[PDB]
């Protein structure tokens, strides 16, 4: 018998992004080919199967720095980190291959699916 | 020119609630008349004007325990904490006064608005 506020989840995510933009309560640095990205562990886990596995590990849950595989493109990561906090994906012809590869590595199934569909349409 | 994934914010919130239910990466205990509630500071801040003010304070941001005003009803708090993580509010005739008072204290404007409307309909 609950009532539901339609815009609540979107409003929560918008506020989480405002905290990210002001660097409030960020608790991890993700290092990608020397580029550094500050974020909230909980948001990373909520969006990515890879981060979910990393931060539920009894040793890794306590790390303040996570280094990604050197094949990971920093721009591809940046686009995906923006998607995690906003639901918006900046997918372009010039970045689609790097975005799909990073999303496969991060285990972000819905992003991988739309990249596969957009690539299939271009062939 | 971004594309948007409609269900992303809802999916993020659902995963944050799964982390709460398994007590993963909770970083604060909220004490309400001896009852204790574990949660994520970022989610509390994203939902409440009161928690936003508390955890942006240079001294309070570092506290692992927050004690609420003794007038705050633990059931009212529990219903609001469930709303924060799910967008669902368990509003009933028997709890509406305690829910509205707790939401006014927590500065959760949309909850206060629906409580005022539901109370106005009963008079």
């Amino acid at each position: 018998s609950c009532i539901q506020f339609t815009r609540h989840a979107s409003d929560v995510l918008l506020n989480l992004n405002r905290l990210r933009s002001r660097d409030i309560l960020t608790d991890v640095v993700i290092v990608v080919s020397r580029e550094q990205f500050r974020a909230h562990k909980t948001v990373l886990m909520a969006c990515s199967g890879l981060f979910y596995s990393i931060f539920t590990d009894q040793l890794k849950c306590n790390l303040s720095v996570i280094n990604l595989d050197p094949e990971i493109n920093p721009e591809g990561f940046c686009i995906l980190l923006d998607f995690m906090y906003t639901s918006r994906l900046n997918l372009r012809e010039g970045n689609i291959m790097a975005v799909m590869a990073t999303a496969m590595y991060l285990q972000m199934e819905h992003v991988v699916d739309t990249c596969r569909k957009f690539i299939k349409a271009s062939e | 020119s971004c594309i948007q994934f409609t269900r992303h914010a809802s999916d993020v919130l659902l995963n944050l609630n799964r982390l709460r239910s398994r007590d993963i990466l909770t970083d604060v205990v909220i004490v309400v008349s001896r009852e204790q509630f574990r949660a994520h500071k970022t989610v509390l801040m994203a939902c409440s004007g009161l928690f936003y003010s508390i955890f942006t304070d240079q001294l309070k941001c570092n506290l692992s325990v927050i004690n609420l005003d003794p007038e705050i009803n633990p059931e009212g708090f529990c219903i609001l904490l469930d709303f924060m993580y799910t967008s669902r509010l368990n509003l009933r005739e028997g709890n509406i006064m305690a829910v509205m008072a707790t939401a006014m204290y927590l500065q959760m404007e949309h909850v206060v608005d629906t409580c005022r409307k539901f109370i106005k309909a009963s008079e």
Binding site: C2, I3, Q4, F5, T6 | R88, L89, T114
Partner: peptide, 4 residues
């Protein structure tokens, strides 16, 4: 607000 809606009935979910």
């Amino acid at each position: 607000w809606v009935i979910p």
